[PDB]
Amino acid sequence: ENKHYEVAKKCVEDLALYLKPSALSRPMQRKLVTLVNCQLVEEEGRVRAMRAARSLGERTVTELILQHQNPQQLSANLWAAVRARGCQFLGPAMQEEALKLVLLALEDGSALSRKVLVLFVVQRLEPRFPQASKTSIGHVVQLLYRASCFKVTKRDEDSSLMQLKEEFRSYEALRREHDAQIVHIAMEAGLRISPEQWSSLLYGDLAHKSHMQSIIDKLQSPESFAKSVQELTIVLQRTGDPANLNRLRPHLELLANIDPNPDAVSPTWEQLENAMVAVKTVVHGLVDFIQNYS
């Protein structure tokens, strides 16, 4: 006898059919299960469902953006940005040894002109890595300078001398500020990159997600659902949108306007119905788009 409840329940059952008693990613599975378990005859269940739907929606936007993202074009863009600010990243093994060699020189509180510091490193990097040039090592040093690792002392008729600050005289402290500056460069160039891409880019493995997450939390605020939809819009403007993903926009906007905060007003049946319809439409879209286009 309740049209709204029937459409809504109908929408949820339909989405349940994506669950194997692997059409979706595991995140989507987790979040879908949450919505499906919601009891729409109770208020605490209608509320929890509005929250679930927003989550599914925000995630859908994310996977769509990720689908358009080429990691080979993305990394070239990272290093271009780095080089455009005078710095370099020589690749996981090489940077490691170089930062260590910097550390080795200045740990004790030694003070060396930039030129003297570069030579020190390059000399000791020769055996394991002969492609090292005074210019490349220079840029690694400029990287550390940009991250404000050095205390520097002016002199007349002779070179300025550089010391590491007390607080960076360890590889943990040094690598952390180093890694942070390369993120800060990513942000300046307008590149959202994920702890897993980062871990892969700087160390060459998936084992530094946690370390990297900690920095991004410190340097960046997470992007609202709203700003993500705007992000996808632009991509779609640039591609021309042959799958008509832009048809999902009304629905994503509806979902993003759901107030997730816990002081929020419970939904009306209408609002609930519209939300379930919206999330159904969006999720179906994601699946169809992945199944039909690369």
PDB file of C-alpha atoms in Angstrom:
ATOM      1  CA  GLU A   1       0.000   0.000   0.000  1.00  0.00           C
ATOM      2  CA  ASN A   2       3.090   2.349   0.252  1.00  0.00           C
ATOM      3  CA  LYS A   3       4.306   3.200  -3.298  1.00  0.00           C
ATOM      4  CA  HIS A   4       7.536   4.811  -1.932  1.00  0.00           C
ATOM      5  CA  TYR A   5       8.647   1.920   0.225  1.00  0.00           C
ATOM      6  CA  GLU A   6       7.954  -0.584  -2.642  1.00  0.00           C
ATOM      7  CA  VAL A   7      10.062   1.306  -5.216  1.00  0.00           C
ATOM      8  CA  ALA A   8      12.844   1.730  -2.655  1.00  0.00           C
ATOM      9  CA  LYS A   9      12.879  -1.893  -1.603  1.00  0.00           C
ATOM     10  CA  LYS A  10      12.655  -2.807  -5.320  1.00  0.00           C
ATOM     11  CA  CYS A  11      15.761  -0.650  -5.997  1.00  0.00           C
ATOM     12  CA  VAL A  12      17.729  -2.300  -3.174  1.00  0.00           C
ATOM     13  CA  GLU A  13      16.851  -5.875  -4.176  1.00  0.00           C
ATOM     14  CA  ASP A  14      17.981  -5.086  -7.740  1.00  0.00           C
ATOM     15  CA  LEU A  15      21.392  -3.948  -6.415  1.00  0.00           C
ATOM     16  CA  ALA A  16      21.629  -7.030  -4.256  1.00  0.00           C
ATOM     17  CA  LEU A  17      21.781  -9.048  -7.493  1.00  0.00           C
ATOM     18  CA  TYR A  18      25.388  -7.776  -7.894  1.00  0.00           C
ATOM     19  CA  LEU A  19      26.356  -9.938  -4.890  1.00  0.00           C
ATOM     20  CA  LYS A  20      27.635 -13.500  -5.519  1.00  0.00           C
ATOM     21  CA  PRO A  21      26.013 -15.952  -3.016  1.00  0.00           C
ATOM     22  CA  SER A  22      32.678 -10.282  -8.572  1.00  0.00           C
ATOM     23  CA  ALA A  23      30.977  -7.646 -10.800  1.00  0.00           C
ATOM     24  CA  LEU A  24      32.018  -4.821  -8.355  1.00  0.00           C
ATOM     25  CA  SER A  25      35.168  -3.839  -6.524  1.00  0.00           C
ATOM     26  CA  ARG A  26      35.491  -4.987  -2.899  1.00  0.00           C
ATOM     27  CA  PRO A  27      34.947  -1.503  -1.514  1.00  0.00           C
ATOM     28  CA  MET A  28      31.675  -1.346  -3.504  1.00  0.00           C
ATOM     29  CA  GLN A  29      30.730  -4.788  -2.213  1.00  0.00           C
ATOM     30  CA  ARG A  30      31.287  -3.752   1.414  1.00  0.00           C
ATOM     31  CA  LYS A  31      29.342  -0.565   1.012  1.00  0.00           C
ATOM     32  CA  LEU A  32      26.607  -2.280  -0.979  1.00  0.00           C
ATOM     33  CA  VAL A  33      26.142  -4.911   1.716  1.00  0.00           C
ATOM     34  CA  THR A  34      25.679  -2.132   4.245  1.00  0.00           C
ATOM     35  CA  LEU A  35      22.792  -0.566   2.300  1.00  0.00           C
ATOM     36  CA  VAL A  36      21.180  -3.934   1.613  1.00  0.00           C
ATOM     37  CA  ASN A  37      21.063  -4.873   5.300  1.00  0.00           C
ATOM     38  CA  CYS A  38      19.244  -1.582   6.229  1.00  0.00           C
ATOM     39  CA  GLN A  39      15.679  -2.065   7.561  1.00  0.00           C
ATOM     40  CA  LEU A  40      13.592   0.549   5.805  1.00  0.00           C
ATOM     41  CA  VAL A  41      10.509   0.091   8.054  1.00  0.00           C
ATOM     42  CA  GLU A  42      12.528   1.527  10.986  1.00  0.00           C
ATOM     43  CA  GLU A  43      13.801   5.104  11.171  1.00  0.00           C
ATOM     44  CA  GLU A  44      17.321   4.129  12.290  1.00  0.00           C
ATOM     45  CA  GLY A  45      17.315   1.963   9.103  1.00  0.00           C
ATOM     46  CA  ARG A  46      16.071   4.728   6.786  1.00  0.00           C
ATOM     47  CA  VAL A  47      18.769   6.999   8.220  1.00  0.00           C
ATOM     48  CA  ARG A  48      21.507   4.367   7.880  1.00  0.00           C
ATOM     49  CA  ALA A  49      20.354   3.821   4.267  1.00  0.00           C
ATOM     50  CA  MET A  50      20.651   7.501   3.333  1.00  0.00           C
ATOM     51  CA  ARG A  51      24.206   7.329   4.706  1.00  0.00           C
ATOM     52  CA  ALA A  52      24.965   4.108   2.848  1.00  0.00           C
ATOM     53  CA  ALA A  53      23.726   5.522  -0.412  1.00  0.00           C
ATOM     54  CA  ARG A  54      25.873   8.655  -0.163  1.00  0.00           C
ATOM     55  CA  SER A  55      28.864   6.414   0.465  1.00  0.00           C
ATOM     56  CA  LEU A  56      28.130   4.234  -2.544  1.00  0.00           C
ATOM     57  CA  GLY A  57      27.699   7.349  -4.583  1.00  0.00           C
ATOM     58  CA  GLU A  58      30.893   9.043  -3.513  1.00  0.00           C
ATOM     59  CA  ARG A  59      32.739   5.842  -4.208  1.00  0.00           C
ATOM     60  CA  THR A  60      31.198   5.463  -7.666  1.00  0.00           C
ATOM     61  CA  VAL A  61      32.489   8.894  -8.642  1.00  0.00           C
ATOM     62  CA  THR A  62      35.920   7.831  -7.424  1.00  0.00           C
ATOM     63  CA  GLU A  63      36.067   4.628  -9.463  1.00  0.00           C
ATOM     64  CA  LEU A  64      34.904   6.529 -12.581  1.00  0.00           C
ATOM     65  CA  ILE A  65      37.634   9.099 -12.223  1.00  0.00           C
ATOM     66  CA  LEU A  66      40.145   6.319 -11.614  1.00  0.00           C
ATOM     67  CA  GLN A  67      39.067   4.603 -14.784  1.00  0.00           C
ATOM     68  CA  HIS A  68      40.067   7.689 -16.825  1.00  0.00           C
ATOM     69  CA  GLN A  69      43.436   7.951 -15.198  1.00  0.00           C
ATOM     70  CA  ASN A  70      46.545   6.716 -16.978  1.00  0.00           C
ATOM     71  CA  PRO A  71      49.433   5.953 -14.569  1.00  0.00           C
ATOM     72  CA  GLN A  72      52.139   6.225 -17.261  1.00  0.00           C
ATOM     73  CA  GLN A  73      50.939   9.753 -18.241  1.00  0.00           C
ATOM     74  CA  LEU A  74      50.425  10.558 -14.509  1.00  0.00           C
ATOM     75  CA  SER A  75      53.986   9.752 -13.349  1.00  0.00           C
ATOM     76  CA  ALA A  76      55.624  11.654 -16.245  1.00  0.00           C
ATOM     77  CA  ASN A  77      53.579  14.589 -15.015  1.00  0.00           C
ATOM     78  CA  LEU A  78      54.822  14.152 -11.453  1.00  0.00           C
ATOM     79  CA  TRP A  79      58.501  14.211 -12.440  1.00  0.00           C
ATOM     80  CA  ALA A  80      57.949  17.122 -14.844  1.00  0.00           C
ATOM     81  CA  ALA A  81      56.561  19.125 -11.927  1.00  0.00           C
ATOM     82  CA  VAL A  82      59.506  18.186  -9.796  1.00  0.00           C
ATOM     83  CA  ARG A  83      61.994  19.191 -12.480  1.00  0.00           C
ATOM     84  CA  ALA A  84      60.017  22.419 -13.068  1.00  0.00           C
ATOM     85  CA  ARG A  85      60.803  23.419  -9.417  1.00  0.00           C
ATOM     86  CA  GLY A  86      64.488  22.608  -9.825  1.00  0.00           C
ATOM     87  CA  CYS A  87      64.388  19.260  -8.009  1.00  0.00           C
ATOM     88  CA  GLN A  88      64.853  15.640  -9.035  1.00  0.00           C
ATOM     89  CA  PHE A  89      63.889  12.141  -7.956  1.00  0.00           C
ATOM     90  CA  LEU A  90      66.378   9.630  -9.283  1.00  0.00           C
ATOM     91  CA  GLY A  91      64.395   6.473  -8.532  1.00  0.00           C
ATOM     92  CA  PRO A  92      63.805   4.387  -5.365  1.00  0.00           C
ATOM     93  CA  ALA A  93      67.226   2.724  -5.021  1.00  0.00           C
ATOM     94  CA  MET A  94      69.209   5.789  -6.025  1.00  0.00           C
ATOM     95  CA  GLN A  95      67.417   8.407  -3.903  1.00  0.00           C
ATOM     96  CA  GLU A  96      67.689   6.091  -0.897  1.00  0.00           C
ATOM     97  CA  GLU A  97      71.472   5.840  -1.198  1.00  0.00           C
ATOM     98  CA  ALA A  98      71.782   9.572  -1.912  1.00  0.00           C
ATOM     99  CA  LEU A  99      69.745  10.732   1.079  1.00  0.00           C
ATOM    100  CA  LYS A 100      71.764   8.295   3.232  1.00  0.00           C
ATOM    101  CA  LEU A 101      74.984   9.792   1.862  1.00  0.00           C
ATOM    102  CA  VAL A 102      73.707  13.268   2.588  1.00  0.00           C
ATOM    103  CA  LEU A 103      72.889  12.103   6.090  1.00  0.00           C
ATOM    104  CA  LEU A 104      76.292  10.477   6.489  1.00  0.00           C
ATOM    105  CA  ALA A 105      77.970  13.793   5.732  1.00  0.00           C
ATOM    106  CA  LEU A 106      75.857  16.051   7.953  1.00  0.00           C
ATOM    107  CA  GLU A 107      74.568  13.867  10.813  1.00  0.00           C
ATOM    108  CA  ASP A 108      77.462  14.793  13.084  1.00  0.00           C
ATOM    109  CA  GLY A 109      76.564  18.455  12.554  1.00  0.00           C
ATOM    110  CA  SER A 110      79.266  18.972   9.882  1.00  0.00           C
ATOM    111  CA  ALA A 111      78.911  22.079   7.709  1.00  0.00           C
ATOM    112  CA  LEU A 112      79.699  21.933   3.979  1.00  0.00           C
ATOM    113  CA  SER A 113      79.279  24.195   1.050  1.00  0.00           C
ATOM    114  CA  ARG A 114      76.723  22.912  -1.405  1.00  0.00           C
ATOM    115  CA  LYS A 115      79.464  22.150  -3.917  1.00  0.00           C
ATOM    116  CA  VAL A 116      81.465  20.244  -1.302  1.00  0.00           C
ATOM    117  CA  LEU A 117      78.349  18.315  -0.211  1.00  0.00           C
ATOM    118  CA  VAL A 118      77.531  17.285  -3.759  1.00  0.00           C
ATOM    119  CA  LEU A 119      81.016  15.983  -4.475  1.00  0.00           C
ATOM    120  CA  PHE A 120      80.967  13.963  -1.237  1.00  0.00           C
ATOM    121  CA  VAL A 121      77.827  12.185  -2.283  1.00  0.00           C
ATOM    122  CA  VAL A 122      78.752  11.656  -5.928  1.00  0.00           C
ATOM    123  CA  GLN A 123      82.135  10.189  -5.033  1.00  0.00           C
ATOM    124  CA  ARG A 124      80.538   7.584  -2.769  1.00  0.00           C
ATOM    125  CA  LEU A 125      77.639   6.890  -5.105  1.00  0.00           C
ATOM    126  CA  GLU A 126      79.973   5.983  -8.016  1.00  0.00           C
ATOM    127  CA  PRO A 127      80.510   2.297  -7.100  1.00  0.00           C
ATOM    128  CA  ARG A 128      76.820   1.314  -6.785  1.00  0.00           C
ATOM    129  CA  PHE A 129      75.442   3.937  -9.283  1.00  0.00           C
ATOM    130  CA  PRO A 130      77.808   5.470 -11.942  1.00  0.00           C
ATOM    131  CA  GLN A 131      75.168   7.611 -13.816  1.00  0.00           C
ATOM    132  CA  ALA A 132      75.280  10.127 -10.891  1.00  0.00           C
ATOM    133  CA  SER A 133      76.227  13.605 -12.002  1.00  0.00           C
ATOM    134  CA  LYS A 134      76.982  16.688  -9.941  1.00  0.00           C
ATOM    135  CA  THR A 135      73.849  18.197 -11.591  1.00  0.00           C
ATOM    136  CA  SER A 136      71.439  15.388 -10.638  1.00  0.00           C
ATOM    137  CA  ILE A 137      72.762  15.265  -7.076  1.00  0.00           C
ATOM    138  CA  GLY A 138      72.530  19.057  -6.987  1.00  0.00           C
ATOM    139  CA  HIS A 139      68.813  18.815  -7.674  1.00  0.00           C
ATOM    140  CA  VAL A 140      68.332  16.231  -4.893  1.00  0.00           C
ATOM    141  CA  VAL A 141      69.952  18.753  -2.579  1.00  0.00           C
ATOM    142  CA  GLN A 142      67.726  21.525  -3.912  1.00  0.00           C
ATOM    143  CA  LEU A 143      64.824  19.198  -3.139  1.00  0.00           C
ATOM    144  CA  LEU A 144      65.895  19.047   0.489  1.00  0.00           C
ATOM    145  CA  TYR A 145      66.387  22.804   0.502  1.00  0.00           C
ATOM    146  CA  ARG A 146      62.850  23.316  -0.788  1.00  0.00           C
ATOM    147  CA  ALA A 147      61.664  21.142   2.132  1.00  0.00           C
ATOM    148  CA  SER A 148      63.677  23.389   4.506  1.00  0.00           C
ATOM    149  CA  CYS A 149      65.980  20.694   5.867  1.00  0.00           C
ATOM    150  CA  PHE A 150      69.075  22.892   6.002  1.00  0.00           C
ATOM    151  CA  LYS A 151      70.261  25.697   8.296  1.00  0.00           C
ATOM    152  CA  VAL A 152      72.490  27.856   6.087  1.00  0.00           C
ATOM    153  CA  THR A 153      75.192  30.344   7.054  1.00  0.00           C
ATOM    154  CA  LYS A 154      76.223  33.241   4.737  1.00  0.00           C
ATOM    155  CA  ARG A 155      79.961  34.018   4.195  1.00  0.00           C
ATOM    156  CA  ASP A 156      81.837  36.745   2.349  1.00  0.00           C
ATOM    157  CA  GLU A 157      84.406  35.909  -0.369  1.00  0.00           C
ATOM    158  CA  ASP A 158      83.579  32.246   0.203  1.00  0.00           C
ATOM    159  CA  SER A 159      80.611  29.891  -0.253  1.00  0.00           C
ATOM    160  CA  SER A 160      77.623  29.600   2.127  1.00  0.00           C
ATOM    161  CA  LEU A 161      77.742  26.566   4.348  1.00  0.00           C
ATOM    162  CA  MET A 162      74.789  24.223   5.004  1.00  0.00           C
ATOM    163  CA  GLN A 163      73.951  22.081   8.040  1.00  0.00           C
ATOM    164  CA  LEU A 164      71.008  19.770   8.557  1.00  0.00           C
ATOM    165  CA  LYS A 165      68.688  21.045  11.269  1.00  0.00           C
ATOM    166  CA  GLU A 166      68.821  19.025  14.520  1.00  0.00           C
ATOM    167  CA  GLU A 167      65.312  17.708  13.829  1.00  0.00           C
ATOM    168  CA  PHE A 168      66.237  16.078  10.444  1.00  0.00           C
ATOM    169  CA  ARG A 169      69.448  14.277  11.488  1.00  0.00           C
ATOM    170  CA  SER A 170      67.986  10.814  10.935  1.00  0.00           C
ATOM    171  CA  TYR A 171      66.805   8.935   7.844  1.00  0.00           C
ATOM    172  CA  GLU A 172      63.214   8.646   9.251  1.00  0.00           C
ATOM    173  CA  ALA A 173      63.001  12.407   9.795  1.00  0.00           C
ATOM    174  CA  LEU A 174      64.780  13.167   6.534  1.00  0.00           C
ATOM    175  CA  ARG A 175      62.971  10.757   4.278  1.00  0.00           C
ATOM    176  CA  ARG A 176      59.630  11.949   5.805  1.00  0.00           C
ATOM    177  CA  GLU A 177      60.247  15.610   5.013  1.00  0.00           C
ATOM    178  CA  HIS A 178      61.561  14.583   1.620  1.00  0.00           C
ATOM    179  CA  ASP A 179      58.540  12.480   0.753  1.00  0.00           C
ATOM    180  CA  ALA A 180      56.277  15.292   2.042  1.00  0.00           C
ATOM    181  CA  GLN A 181      57.842  17.877  -0.271  1.00  0.00           C
ATOM    182  CA  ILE A 182      57.244  15.651  -3.317  1.00  0.00           C
ATOM    183  CA  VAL A 183      53.573  15.452  -2.289  1.00  0.00           C
ATOM    184  CA  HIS A 184      53.453  19.228  -1.867  1.00  0.00           C
ATOM    185  CA  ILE A 185      54.797  19.443  -5.447  1.00  0.00           C
ATOM    186  CA  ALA A 186      52.053  17.029  -6.596  1.00  0.00           C
ATOM    187  CA  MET A 187      49.470  19.366  -5.043  1.00  0.00           C
ATOM    188  CA  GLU A 188      50.976  22.459  -6.677  1.00  0.00           C
ATOM    189  CA  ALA A 189      50.789  20.739 -10.082  1.00  0.00           C
ATOM    190  CA  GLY A 190      47.168  19.676  -9.384  1.00  0.00           C
ATOM    191  CA  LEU A 191      47.605  15.920  -9.117  1.00  0.00           C
ATOM    192  CA  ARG A 192      45.621  13.798  -6.672  1.00  0.00           C
ATOM    193  CA  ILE A 193      47.638  10.635  -6.048  1.00  0.00           C
ATOM    194  CA  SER A 194      46.870   7.808  -3.621  1.00  0.00           C
ATOM    195  CA  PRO A 195      49.023   6.307  -0.823  1.00  0.00           C
ATOM    196  CA  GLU A 196      49.310   3.098  -2.923  1.00  0.00           C
ATOM    197  CA  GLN A 197      50.495   5.009  -6.062  1.00  0.00           C
ATOM    198  CA  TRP A 198      52.854   7.043  -3.885  1.00  0.00           C
ATOM    199  CA  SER A 199      54.259   3.896  -2.177  1.00  0.00           C
ATOM    200  CA  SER A 200      54.831   2.474  -5.654  1.00  0.00           C
ATOM    201  CA  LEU A 201      56.350   5.699  -7.065  1.00  0.00           C
ATOM    202  CA  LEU A 202      58.907   6.490  -4.317  1.00  0.00           C
ATOM    203  CA  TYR A 203      59.804   3.052  -2.897  1.00  0.00           C
ATOM    204  CA  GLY A 204      58.780   0.602  -5.695  1.00  0.00           C
ATOM    205  CA  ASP A 205      56.374  -1.519  -3.592  1.00  0.00           C
ATOM    206  CA  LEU A 206      52.909  -1.398  -1.876  1.00  0.00           C
ATOM    207  CA  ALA A 207      54.512  -1.502   1.617  1.00  0.00           C
ATOM    208  CA  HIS A 208      54.501   2.269   2.404  1.00  0.00           C
ATOM    209  CA  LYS A 209      50.741   3.043   2.095  1.00  0.00           C
ATOM    210  CA  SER A 210      50.505   3.677   5.856  1.00  0.00           C
ATOM    211  CA  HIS A 211      53.582   6.009   5.960  1.00  0.00           C
ATOM    212  CA  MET A 212      52.298   7.915   2.937  1.00  0.00           C
ATOM    213  CA  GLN A 213      48.675   8.145   4.226  1.00  0.00           C
ATOM    214  CA  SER A 214      49.975   9.832   7.376  1.00  0.00           C
ATOM    215  CA  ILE A 215      51.495  12.676   5.279  1.00  0.00           C
ATOM    216  CA  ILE A 216      48.547  13.220   2.983  1.00  0.00           C
ATOM    217  CA  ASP A 217      46.292  13.492   6.091  1.00  0.00           C
ATOM    218  CA  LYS A 218      48.753  16.224   7.352  1.00  0.00           C
ATOM    219  CA  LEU A 219      49.189  18.140   4.058  1.00  0.00           C
ATOM    220  CA  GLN A 220      45.699  17.749   2.430  1.00  0.00           C
ATOM    221  CA  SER A 221      41.966  17.955   3.307  1.00  0.00           C
ATOM    222  CA  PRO A 222      39.896  15.140   1.647  1.00  0.00           C
ATOM    223  CA  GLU A 223      37.782  16.214  -1.359  1.00  0.00           C
ATOM    224  CA  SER A 224      34.085  16.635  -0.868  1.00  0.00           C
ATOM    225  CA  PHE A 225      31.683  14.480  -2.888  1.00  0.00           C
ATOM    226  CA  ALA A 226      30.671  17.718  -4.567  1.00  0.00           C
ATOM    227  CA  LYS A 227      34.221  18.628  -5.710  1.00  0.00           C
ATOM    228  CA  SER A 228      34.721  15.033  -6.988  1.00  0.00           C
ATOM    229  CA  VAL A 229      31.637  15.380  -9.198  1.00  0.00           C
ATOM    230  CA  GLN A 230      33.021  18.579 -10.592  1.00  0.00           C
ATOM    231  CA  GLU A 231      36.338  16.717 -11.211  1.00  0.00           C
ATOM    232  CA  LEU A 232      34.546  14.021 -13.204  1.00  0.00           C
ATOM    233  CA  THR A 233      32.561  16.605 -15.118  1.00  0.00           C
ATOM    234  CA  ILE A 234      35.798  18.082 -16.423  1.00  0.00           C
ATOM    235  CA  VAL A 235      37.281  14.796 -17.486  1.00  0.00           C
ATOM    236  CA  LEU A 236      33.993  14.125 -19.255  1.00  0.00           C
ATOM    237  CA  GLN A 237      34.086  17.548 -20.925  1.00  0.00           C
ATOM    238  CA  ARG A 238      37.601  16.696 -22.143  1.00  0.00           C
ATOM    239  CA  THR A 239      36.682  13.178 -23.355  1.00  0.00           C
ATOM    240  CA  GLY A 240      33.339  14.156 -24.900  1.00  0.00           C
ATOM    241  CA  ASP A 241      31.658  11.450 -22.859  1.00  0.00           C
ATOM    242  CA  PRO A 242      30.822   8.788 -25.422  1.00  0.00           C
ATOM    243  CA  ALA A 243      28.998   6.689 -22.751  1.00  0.00           C
ATOM    244  CA  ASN A 244      26.878   9.598 -21.545  1.00  0.00           C
ATOM    245  CA  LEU A 245      28.121   9.266 -17.960  1.00  0.00           C
ATOM    246  CA  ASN A 246      26.914  12.859 -17.538  1.00  0.00           C
ATOM    247  CA  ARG A 247      23.393  11.464 -17.336  1.00  0.00           C
ATOM    248  CA  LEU A 248      24.307  10.343 -13.788  1.00  0.00           C
ATOM    249  CA  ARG A 249      24.935  13.932 -12.599  1.00  0.00           C
ATOM    250  CA  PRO A 250      21.435  14.798 -11.280  1.00  0.00           C
ATOM    251  CA  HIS A 251      21.614  11.585  -9.242  1.00  0.00           C
ATOM    252  CA  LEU A 252      25.110  12.223  -7.853  1.00  0.00           C
ATOM    253  CA  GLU A 253      24.068  15.724  -6.837  1.00  0.00           C
ATOM    254  CA  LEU A 254      21.031  14.339  -5.083  1.00  0.00           C
ATOM    255  CA  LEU A 255      23.274  11.929  -3.167  1.00  0.00           C
ATOM    256  CA  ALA A 256      25.905  14.492  -2.317  1.00  0.00           C
ATOM    257  CA  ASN A 257      23.231  16.710  -0.717  1.00  0.00           C
ATOM    258  CA  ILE A 258      22.380  13.990   1.775  1.00  0.00           C
ATOM    259  CA  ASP A 259      23.572  15.213   5.135  1.00  0.00           C
ATOM    260  CA  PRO A 260      25.753  12.421   6.551  1.00  0.00           C
ATOM    261  CA  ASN A 261      26.351  14.187   9.938  1.00  0.00           C
ATOM    262  CA  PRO A 262      24.673  12.494  12.900  1.00  0.00           C
ATOM    263  CA  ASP A 263      22.501  15.507  14.010  1.00  0.00           C
ATOM    264  CA  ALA A 264      20.717  15.226  10.606  1.00  0.00           C
ATOM    265  CA  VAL A 265      16.978  15.147  10.071  1.00  0.00           C
ATOM    266  CA  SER A 266      15.526  11.765   9.201  1.00  0.00           C
ATOM    267  CA  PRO A 267      14.337  11.236   5.613  1.00  0.00           C
ATOM    268  CA  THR A 268      10.823  11.291   4.299  1.00  0.00           C
ATOM    269  CA  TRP A 269       9.733   8.256   2.322  1.00  0.00           C
ATOM    270  CA  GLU A 270       9.914  10.390  -0.849  1.00  0.00           C
ATOM    271  CA  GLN A 271      13.499  11.451  -0.127  1.00  0.00           C
ATOM    272  CA  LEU A 272      14.361   7.896   0.618  1.00  0.00           C
ATOM    273  CA  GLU A 273      12.773   6.614  -2.613  1.00  0.00           C
ATOM    274  CA  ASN A 274      14.580   9.204  -4.643  1.00  0.00           C
ATOM    275  CA  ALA A 275      17.860   8.355  -2.976  1.00  0.00           C
ATOM    276  CA  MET A 276      17.548   4.597  -3.663  1.00  0.00           C
ATOM    277  CA  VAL A 277      16.577   5.274  -7.254  1.00  0.00           C
ATOM    278  CA  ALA A 278      19.586   7.546  -7.535  1.00  0.00           C
ATOM    279  CA  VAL A 279      22.067   5.054  -6.139  1.00  0.00           C
ATOM    280  CA  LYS A 280      20.641   2.259  -8.286  1.00  0.00           C
ATOM    281  CA  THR A 281      21.066   4.344 -11.378  1.00  0.00           C
ATOM    282  CA  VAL A 282      24.591   5.377 -10.522  1.00  0.00           C
ATOM    283  CA  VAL A 283      25.800   1.856  -9.623  1.00  0.00           C
ATOM    284  CA  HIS A 284      24.247   0.299 -12.701  1.00  0.00           C
ATOM    285  CA  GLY A 285      26.077   2.999 -14.658  1.00  0.00           C
ATOM    286  CA  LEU A 286      29.443   2.189 -13.122  1.00  0.00           C
ATOM    287  CA  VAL A 287      29.073  -1.497 -13.903  1.00  0.00           C
ATOM    288  CA  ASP A 288      27.832  -0.999 -17.483  1.00  0.00           C
ATOM    289  CA  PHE A 289      30.608   1.514 -18.127  1.00  0.00           C
ATOM    290  CA  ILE A 290      33.335  -0.847 -16.911  1.00  0.00           C
ATOM    291  CA  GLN A 291      31.877  -3.931 -18.621  1.00  0.00           C
ATOM    292  CA  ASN A 292      31.579  -2.093 -21.989  1.00  0.00           C
ATOM    293  CA  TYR A 293      34.607   0.307 -22.202  1.00  0.00           C
ATOM    294  CA  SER A 294      38.185  -0.970 -21.332  1.00  0.00           C
TER     295      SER A 294
END
